[PDB]
Amino acid sequence: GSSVVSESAVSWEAGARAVLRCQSPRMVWTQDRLHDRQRVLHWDLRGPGPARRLLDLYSAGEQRVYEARDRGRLELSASAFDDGNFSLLIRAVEETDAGLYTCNLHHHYCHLYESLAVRLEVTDGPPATPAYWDGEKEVLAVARGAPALLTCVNRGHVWTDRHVEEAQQVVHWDRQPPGVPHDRADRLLDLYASGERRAYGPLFLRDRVAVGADAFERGDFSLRIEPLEVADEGTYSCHLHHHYCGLHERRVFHLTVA
Amino acid sequence: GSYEHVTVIPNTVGVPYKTLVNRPGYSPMVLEMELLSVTLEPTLSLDYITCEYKTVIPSPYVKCCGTAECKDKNLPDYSCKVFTGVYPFMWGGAYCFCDAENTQLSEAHVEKSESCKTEFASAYRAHTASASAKLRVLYQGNNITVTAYANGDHAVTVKDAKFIVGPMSSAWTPFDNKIVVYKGDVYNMDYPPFGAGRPGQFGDIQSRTPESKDVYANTQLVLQRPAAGTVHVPYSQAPSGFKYWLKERGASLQHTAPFGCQIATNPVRAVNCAVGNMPISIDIPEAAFTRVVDAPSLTDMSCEVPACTHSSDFGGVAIIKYAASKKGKCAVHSMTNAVTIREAEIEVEGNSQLQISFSTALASAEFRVQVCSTQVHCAAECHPPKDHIVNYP
Amino acid sequence: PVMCLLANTTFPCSQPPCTPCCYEKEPEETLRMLEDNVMRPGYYQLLQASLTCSPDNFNVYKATRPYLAHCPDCGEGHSCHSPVALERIRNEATDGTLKIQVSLQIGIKTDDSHDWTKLRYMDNHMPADAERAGLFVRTSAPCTITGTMGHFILARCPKGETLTVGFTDSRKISHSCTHPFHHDPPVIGREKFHSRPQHGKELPCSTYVQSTAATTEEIEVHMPPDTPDRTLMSQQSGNVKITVNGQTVRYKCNCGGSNEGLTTTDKVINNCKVDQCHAAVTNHKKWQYNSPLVPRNAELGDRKGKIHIPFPLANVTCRVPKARNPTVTYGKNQVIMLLYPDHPTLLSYRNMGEEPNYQEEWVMHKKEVVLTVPTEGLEVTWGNNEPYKYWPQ
Ligand SMILES: *[C@@H]1O[C@H](CO)[C@@H](O[C@H]2O[C@H](CO)[C@@H](O)[C@H](O)[C@H]2NC(C)=O)[C@H](O)[C@H]1NC(C)=O
């Protein structure tokens, strides 16, 4: 893609080790967690810290309530990830439920985070002007024993998709000789999820141009050039791309030799 | 104060051999003898045992933000190695916080398996076997049994009749100087000595006793490199020579040893080896002997054979009319080699006729038979049998 | 009078100073006491006395726990952190009983009580029960399980080249782990059969006894590593906040201030972001298998303890078929045998001369074979039947 974040300029000597640091931990991919630890969900509670974990949910089936006494009283949609309804229902609100709840999400596939905080107050009598304060944390006042519906909803494709199994990425390394309008830039290297080290340059050029070995699980795709030719100066582009997760990034580098 | 008779019979179990006891002034006797078992018990010495080996791999030392160093300890086939450039991944994330300077120290070694107490193979040194035998004797018309060392040094005093057996005409033993035993079977094998086991072969690991804590083993244990983002200790290693030998052993001596020996373990022993011959010394007591005066002397005897058939068994029936002197026991012997008689002793009283059996291989049989004092002739023709093959000696 | 050591003192191993209910009083102190005495002879006395707690109640599984480990094939090809990961497969039993060892614990609930209908696995921080009835082991067809206790499963798998062990967890989602394993148990005797027949013969073999009595074998266990989890860190809009969740957390940040520490409560590091920090959960209260698939705790040294395990190896009797009687016909120095095998049957024959010329062949189908009958003798072993003996007339 074309979402240039930062541009650099490096100056190394002739015949010296040139390294273009294109490092991004959002591309780390080692092995499938098999759709069970890909995405997780969990709620926390505050008294008042310390914060306590009430119950968590994986992308597979039913939930797990870490406290046994609260079992059967709290209920999320067991079919939430199919349509994205992560709301928590408290059938019988007891006074020990008053505090600060927080809906926390994780997307270990693409390393995302989208939380929201909600306060809950237990009024001994009927409703007590329950819902307000949109501009910040929403607080709900609920009577003793009455049910409470604490909303946490995300409808994006990244979350509610029992879909492609854990892997598809792409990293391009492009080259531009001086003055080139970037429209027909030279192609240098391709790096794929399963691994296709497609070298496009000439034969005696793809003997020093080598992305560091194993560089798809540290996230450090730094390009290495062992001897530096004076004709190798130009504007290189670490063309990044990860569809389905919004990673149309691209870093640029200006390499000069003296 | 009796007499000592000596004879020699082939060391073949189940073949009845007749000898003629001849004491001067006494009635002849027909002793039948049948060897029942012959035990060859070799003196053994344990070298070592072998069993399936166990590769011990303790949890690796993943030192984060640092470098680990090996220390060669004294463990059988201790294999240590340090590895650089690792980023181990547990489900909760990265074990090591630093991006570089991550090292994994992998150790491994070899010891006896927990199964080395039941599944094992014993390697022995067999030399200078010792013999023993068991024989049936038809004396006084009684089937008596004797057991002694088959070397002629120790005697058996059975009913005041002294018996001596040995030595063996052959010093053979189907066990070599070095043998191996696995729990039901004996094998001849020049097994590698203690401290010479090779990987993949018999005894890649060796131990003098199943309990001796220290053992000898080399199995070519080399540690591979762990895959990236993974906590494991891969190895390369020659598999157990034991389990290889368990498939690759072949038939034991119970199926392949010459002369039809029988092989049994615990103790390692060979039985009924039909090799050579064996002497027999019988010191009969003087009491059971009876002079010619007290002995029934048969006179004017005749022989008649209605039917006969030449084969390995007593395929002929004979009947002898006689005029004995009085009532009493008497013997029946065959003077000739090519003819044998099943009977040895019958009862005579006055004038009667007796029924016996005989065996040979030729068609026209002419031979003499003596009954307890006197000889007579028997002649007949014998047919062939229906069996060319026979399942008895 | 067998003595154990604390760090400066001696005392009888069967009566430590923390009695009674040593573990429940001080968990961490009790484990260190066992670790420091692991080499002493009365260690297993200290274990039986420092883990039991009565109001015998000796339940070792209060100190152990299930765990997650690497598995290569979790189904659908890719590798995963499986709670049913395998550690080692044992095929030393002659009958083919496999002794599988996995990373979950069968027969124990999370509250350490004994219950056969339940087993406990690990769910990302917390053990959890699951239904034993949903457990399965299969190579090519499902294996008949004969015993489950702790980490150990006994099974009867049919001939196969792989092996899969799996269960169904709390949330009715299946977990499975598959390894390569050449499973073909060795043949007992002289015929390759598949289900013990009626009449047969009784031959020695080895099997894994189905009792859970812990007598002889042992495994090694140590404290777990600092276990990481990315869910601990939070972003308080300019800083990092961590939550302990009833545990203790070792954190490390790449910033200023107290960029590291071991906090028992929730703490906040200022002037920092999440990606610079990394935290794990320490737990010196439980034990874990000394597994190559799990790293070793770096701070502590080589501290280790040992615990016994069920299902020892023991030699018992297996029953094999006797192959049916062949059809026999005779001839001049010839025996013609027509063999009817219902399964691969071994046939061997040896001459009783000095050169037996032992010949064997895996008779597979109906075959008429002709054998020479020399005067020396012939012994024919047909399957597991007693040896035939054939001689010439
Ligand atoms: C002595 O022992 C032999 C051998 O056991 C006895 O054997 C014979 O008895 C059977 C009686 O019918 C015959 O059918 C057998 O063929 C025969 N066996 C042999 C090997 O010769 C014999 O009766 C015994 N006799 C005495 C007096 O003890």
Ligand SMILES: *[C@@H]1O[C@H](CO)[C@@H](O)[C@H](O)[C@H]1NC(C)=O
């Ligand atoms: C049976 O196993 C025991 C060990 O449990 C061993 O001592 C014994 O020798 C074995 N016996 C046979 C016949 O293998």
